[PDB]
């Protein structure tokens, strides 16, 4: 399909080199083969192939200085060449010898008036996961990424705009953050900003956003580039006083903190898929800012929401304890029919003043449900449950207003959805927070992978056991009446949570006692203690990084509280300017000791 | 509040520097800006701000030699300056340039008759956890802590008392033990004691106590400073003979052992909150002294107390086995009323001579209870239980003397409080001692953190299950009658200590079998084996450091036995002086091999 075609275009490129001898001698520099063909007939000086390549392209792509130079006097009208077939579209040979770091050949290109503007918008230059280089779309963006100091100075002299944006809006400082060698990215970064000693009006190149709106300070935090992040912090510092080993220092907090309706750096670190971005979250202004927001305004508001939710769940719980039951009207259709009670009706529900006090609690309940949805629906996993909990009150609101069957099951959902959301509020404690991360990674990581192997062993053995108690007396190790019940027995004999079956009274069915021994060795010993050994590794894995998993829970919570509460209750953190003479910016003081 | 105000006072300091140009040019040395203002109008030569700072202070705090010297001829009447607003109170600039290690500027201060006496009693110099330096309150105490060898010699020449005590009584040798760099603390320590070649009367500076009474030998043991501790031991040694690889050595034991009613070093290491202090407990005189006290007098007395307590608990146990029961008077109020017996009365209790022998045992019991309280109340966790055990005998003493209901429950406390105090006496064995440390750290470390998450899952599911068996026949998986009993069922289905419920006889309630499968995956597999993986780490953690946890149990026990037993049964450990000609001190011989 796609990658098949891309490999075909590589060898069909290899074919048309071997077709034309001018294209062939461009690869291996046979100057004899070159200057024979040039002193001959015209012989297709700009004939293209599948990709749009030329002989000057191939001599550059296979590192031929001499074969290219002889071709230059032969045809100087070429050099402005857009290699263009949908995947290489825009690329020049002046792109090529820069990526190959060929300083002699790009000198001859800039001698013949090369184009340091050319936008390589071909799909092998997009920022995609299927293209394992992203160097930009410009020669100066190419020269920067490959650590090519000489050429970088050379290109700008010939008119290479340091400010030019590619088809994602990224400047060359945005592209240097995306490079995998984080240390060599730093040195080429300063060389481009040094040359921006001109042009300080309109965001002097280290404030210019892309189409996403991010600056190179905020993009280093989103991409997790901590080395570039600690570099750019030094511009946003201010040493204040150095009394011995003490040191006071102000941090800038204009792009780190919530400037306005813009997405702050703490919002973008939480709302990203990249895992390395959460190592920004303990750097020297950020860790102090989160601790200041949590200890002074985040933890008091979170504990008061945790207490109001705890009373509301009791005010839910006590109403569904006292739910309208009555003795039944009809009688037993079977001896197995074994209810002794029945749901009451709304007409005869609220008769006493005792029940008048009850419906207060249920009106506290239902009003709480529409408050939840009006908060949440106009927008992690506890978001899903609290929407499901509000849904389950408004289900059994509807079912009682038309007085129908099965109130219990929408409530049977509701309690465990309701009370396990108190475990949400366990993140407000250092020593209880990452316990819920353990619970998740065991379910979605260890249960949901091994569960398929457990259920295969169930349906194997539970069918195997149900043909042994089908032709028997169903009260006498009646652990198997039904393929439903046999899936309920073997689920609870795998786990050893009910008794391993035996009756020891009657002449027992034979093949069973062979079979349950086969079962109990492989289920209750081998595959149950597989899972216990699995989840023991998950516990060890999450308890190891337990501090940094809790800190990411606090940043997620503090951002969530700050956006939704009104500004008159969440004061802006830090010390304001304009009275201490620093600017209108909002700073933060940190004092340390070395 | 507090730290908010402290940061405001740092930037308001930064404001009033930027207000007055004399204060501004004190920071960055603009001598031009200085000598313009000085050849002008008087212009407030000693105007203060919020903190009481001066221009000579700011030039010293921001390291200006030249700006300070020009200011000295301008106003030589300053230098005696008490910077004084409640938090900086007492501090001189002569304090400041010493902490900044500015040897040229303090030369010009001592040229202009500086004050090496000044007591920086401001709250930013107290020994508090919120001030992360404690260098003392004096310039010589400052110069010592910052490792400033040159200035330390210089100050004493200008009359810096090495013996001066700050507002906690600590001398400079006390303050050098509190410094975090333990190796550089040692070298500056000797330089101050070398200069105490004068003044040997009245405790020659290495015996002088603070207001707590501690010497620098005993303070190094309380603070856990093992490097300073092994240093000061060398003064308290005596090599005795060196026969080949053998070596005999006497240790001093005047401050290590219990000199009298004073608090010995072994008492202060146990009664401290610092954790590093228990690494003193295996140094070369201390480890031999504890082993000598334990093997010769501690372990015999502890095993005899462990045997007398074991007989007393049997003498408690057998009486509350034979407790006054009789057949009941009334009859069954319900079929569920199912006692077949009743408490007897004190009148008809002691009728036979068999019961006369019983009350002997109970008088052994009660006398044992008031002995415990008369021992203990006029003063760790086994202290709390043995006071609670003595309380529970004297509860059921009172209840029988007025012949009332419920003897059993104060006794039901009493047994498990009584017999688990035998586990106290497991510290008298090397291989049984730190088992009780495991039991504590699992309860207060692993249970009491995760218990909140277990109970949340209980009330979630046990409410969820109790609405499924409310409208049923309560004898048929009657594991749920009551929200009390449902909290008792789900506590014992979480733990899988009772059978996972099933009846398999009647048409079963439907939503239950969905729900218990939801429950048994998350309770009996996921969250129960969370705790087993948690407490397995606690076991590994305590069994790793199991020798040094047992040795701290012995020091705690030996000190406790020695204080309470009379002196005529606990002889003073070691070899006395005054007959072997060493002094009146009590020494200890150790023989080793290298
Ligand atoms: C921790 C404290 C636990 C205390 C547990 C108390 C347990 C036991 C007492 C029929 O039965 C007789 C009537 O009793 C009821 O039925 C009460 C039904 C609803 C109770 C919920 C509070 C009522 C008012 C809602 C008030 C607003 C509460 C929520 C606002 C945030
Ligand atoms: C990890 C997730 C695992 C999910 C599955 C775990 C189980 C959850 C499944 C279902 C959840 C609950 C729904 C009930 C469905 C069963 C219907 C039933 O029992 O009816 C009948 C049986 O009929 C059957 O046996 C149907 C089952 C076919 C074999 C299993 C395939 C389904 C899953 C496999 C997919 C492979 C996935 C695994 C590998 C990829 C009942 O018969 P009876 O009334 O007793 O008749 C008496 C006979 N007499 C009349 C002669 C006297
Ligand atoms: C994980 C592995 C664990 C083992 C699990 C087994 C794995 C496979 C093992 C063995 C596979 C072979 C199974 C043959 C079964 C047919 C025999 C028969 O019909 O029984 C007859 C009984 O008479 C007997 O009991 C004779 C003995 C048969 C089994 C011999 C020991 C097998 C295990 C040796 C050691 C194992 C070596 C393990 C390797 C270390 C008939 O029974 P009945 O009572 O007369 O009446 C029946 C009436 N009914 C039909 C209505 C009910
Ligand atoms: C290891 C040894 C275990 C031996 C266990 C013996 C077990 C079995 C014998 C009515 O029943 C008939 C009367 O018997 C009793 O009721 C005795 C009740 C009190 C017993 C306590 C010792 C009595 C004197 C206390 C003596 C002072 C003892 C404490 C002083 C330190
Ligand atoms: C780690 C420590 C955990 C502590 C809690 C663990 C549990 C220990 C708690 C208590 C210990 C024992 C005391 C008994 C109290 C219950 C009273 C009761 O059952 O009465 C009644 C119910 O009423 C209730 O349901 C009250 C419980 C409200 C919800 C739970 C809140 C309390 C704990 C949560 C605090 C959050 C802390 C967790 C997160 C921060 C009994 O009802 P009935 O008689 O069957 O009536 C039949 C109805 N009929 C009349 C229609 C027929
Ligand atoms: C940790 C997770 C473990 C799973 C736990 C479950 C989690 C959530 C799962 C599912 C949520 C949805 C629940 C819907 C229940 C309502 C249906 C109903 O009313 O039943 C009817 C029965 O008729 C049936 O049995 C129809 C089948 C319903 C369930 C289908 C399989 C669900 C699990 C698929 C596989 C799971 C996939 C798991 C992912 C790998 C009514 O019953 P009745 O007998 O006719 O009479 C009732 C009388 N009574 C009211 C007095 C009692
Ligand atoms: C009816 C009376 C008693 C008024 C009180 C009702 C409260 C019980 C509810 C109403 C809506 C509120 C909620 C509003 C929305 C939020 C979402 C929040 O969602 C998450 O769990 C974040 C998910 C994640 O990050 O993993 C948790 C509950 C919270 C703070 C609130 C919890 C409690 C509140 C105050
Ligand atoms: C009543 C019957 C029909 C089923 C009810 C069981 C499940 C639907 C619920 C109830 C309790 C569980 C929850 C309990 C707690 C966890 C932690 C987890 O929290 C996190 O996301 C960790 C990261 C963070 O907190 O930020 C999210 C939900 C999860 C897996 C669970 C999701 C689903 C579970 C199995
Ligand atoms: C009535 C007749 C049988 C006389 C014998 C009574 C003994 C059973 C009791 C009386 C009070 C004594 C106690 C006195 C006080 C101490 C406190 C000691 O406290 C602790 O557990 C230390 C706590 C800790 O360091 O963690 C334990 C028991 C002990 C030695 C004694 C145990 C046994 C004694 C001899
Ligand atoms: C009868 C019912 C109502 C409750 C009785 C149970 C608890 C009150 C007691 C009985 C046994 C336990 C104790 C058993 C032994 C441990 C070891 C622990 O010993 C230590 O302090 C270790 C350090 C040292 O020994 O010096 C202190 C008490 C502890 C946790 C326990 C404290 C409380 C427990 C749970
Ligand atoms: C073995 C564990 C740790 C997890 C492995 C896979 C589970 C995801 C599967 C295995 C088979 C189970 C099923 C087994 C049979 C039941 C019957 C249930 O409804 C009924 O038919 C019985 C209701 C009644 O008896 O009235 C629906 C699905 C359920 C809980 C199960 C759903 C999920 C389970 C736990
Ligand atoms: Ca059982
Ligand atoms: Ca069992």
Author numbering:
A (entry chain C), B (entry chain D): 28 to 406, 423 to 637
Relevant lines from the article:
The TMD is composed of six transmembrane helices S1–S6 and a re-entrant pore loop (P-loop) between S5 and S6. As in all representatives of the tetrameric ion channel family, the ion-conducting pore of TRPV6 has two narrow regions, the selectivity filter formed by the extended regions of the P-loop and the gate formed by the S6 bundle crossing, separated by the central cavity in the middle.
In hTRPV6Open, the pore is wide open and its narrow region is lined by residues N572 and I575. Formation of the π-bulge is accompanied by a ~100° rotation of the C-terminal portion of S6, which brings a completely different set of residues to face the pore and opens it for ion conduction. When binding to the open TRPV6 channel perpendicularly to the central pore axis, genistein molecules pull one diagonal pair of subunits (A/C) asymmetrically towards the channel center. TRPV6 is a constitutively open ion channel.
